[PDB]
Write a protein that binds this DNA or RNA. Structure first.
Ligand SMILES: [Ca+2]
Ligand SMILES: [Ca+2]
Ligand SMILES: [Ca+2]
Ligand SMILES: [Ca+2]
Ligand SMILES: [Ca+2]
Ligand SMILES: [Ca+2]
Ligand SMILES: [Ca+2]
Ligand SMILES: [Ca+2]
Ligand SMILES: [Ca+2]
Ligand SMILES: [Ca+2]
Ligand SMILES: [Ca+2]
Lengths: 155, 155
RNA sequence: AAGUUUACCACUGACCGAUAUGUGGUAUAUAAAUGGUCGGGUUGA
RNA sequence: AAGUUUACCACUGACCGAUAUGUGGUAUAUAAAUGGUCGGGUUGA
């Protein structure tokens, strides 16, 4: 994987981890964003699932925004396919190389977040969210057990 | 000289160049800012004179700002002595090492523009102003002849 | 797909302090990314 | 101290064009610094 690219993840990942709170892979159709490599173990990569349910995710953003705060758990931006996507940073999770199926493409090119300023903002939000998750913060009552996944990946 | 430092220039410079439009050096009491070294000749340095006449220079800035444009010829910023200074980028000029008298000081330390973001903005404004001056632009009818000075410095 | 609880840790430039509505980090604090503001301070335009 | 006339050159990301109210550069354009918008285009949530 290359940083800021979008990818499809093998269903095998989801059946191996068996976590009912990960965003469903929709049979290898949900694009996932590769945010950054883990600092502590090489070969573990942090991914963020996307959703196109903008009406739903805008309301969640506006919960914070309407109180004068940034939303770190969701970030909505127009991708290079010219449509808006929600990055569910809240639901980010770790993965290893063997679980990656392929590049997510647009007309046979690799879709990726080419706008560096958007990538940078997303990366910051993700570091913050991951920091908070590691310290036991729960943004929803249905939060994936990324600690369990992370330990399983430690091969 | 070190980039972003303030300096006093020898009166000898001003009597040698005899340019009535350079900002008067007030008998070696006008601080001057060292912006950047000349690209074409080492040992030639571009300087910017300062003025504390903020009321006057604010009006000149607002001529452009009031039409929605940036002012590049004048930039006003609070220095580390906690007072506002006008950088008369319009009146910038070249100099060589032998015309520098000494560091401009605050309580025996070297006054300099430590706020990098301000230094960067000023450097950009200066590159633009110098570019325009080299192409014959005249911001005032009383503009120093920096070409003549620049040639004299070449020796 | 559904699901909707923002924590903690440091940092904020003449120099000496302080500080968040600013900066970044994620168990680390000689890091990273900021450089505003307030008090002291101050030859010089 | 007084003095108060903003030019030109390129650049604006799946890909192909275009563009300044955006980016930077100063005689250079395989540079630098930006990455919005419009038109085309588009398996997948
Ligand atoms: Ca794009
Ligand atoms: Ca379109
Ligand atoms: Ca300062
Ligand atoms: Ca003060
Ligand atoms: Ca510091
Ligand atoms: Ca301090
Ligand atoms: Ca403190
Ligand atoms: Ca450091
Ligand atoms: Ca480019
Ligand atoms: Ca283009
Ligand atoms: Ca063009």
């Amino acid at each position: 994987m290359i940083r800021n690219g979008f990818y499809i993840i093998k269903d095998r990942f989801f059946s191996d981890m068996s976590d009912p709170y990960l965003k469903g892979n929709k049979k290898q159709n949900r694009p996932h964003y590769y945010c950054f490599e883990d600092s502590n173990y090489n070969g573990i990569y942090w991914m963020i699932p996307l959703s196109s349910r903008i009406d739903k995710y805008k309301k969640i953003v506006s919960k914070r925004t309407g109180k004068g705060r940034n939303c770190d758990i969701i970030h909505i931006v127009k991708l290079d396919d010219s449509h808006e996507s929600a990055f569910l940073i809240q639901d980010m999770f770790p993965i290893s190389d063997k679980y990656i199926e392929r590049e997510y493409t647009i007309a046979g090119n690799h879709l990726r977040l080419t706008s560096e300023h958007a990538a940078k903002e997303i990366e910051q939000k993700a570091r913050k969210v991951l920091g908070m998750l590691k310290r036991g913060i729960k943004f929803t009552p249905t939060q994936p057990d990324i600690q369990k996944i992370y330990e399983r990946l430690q091969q």
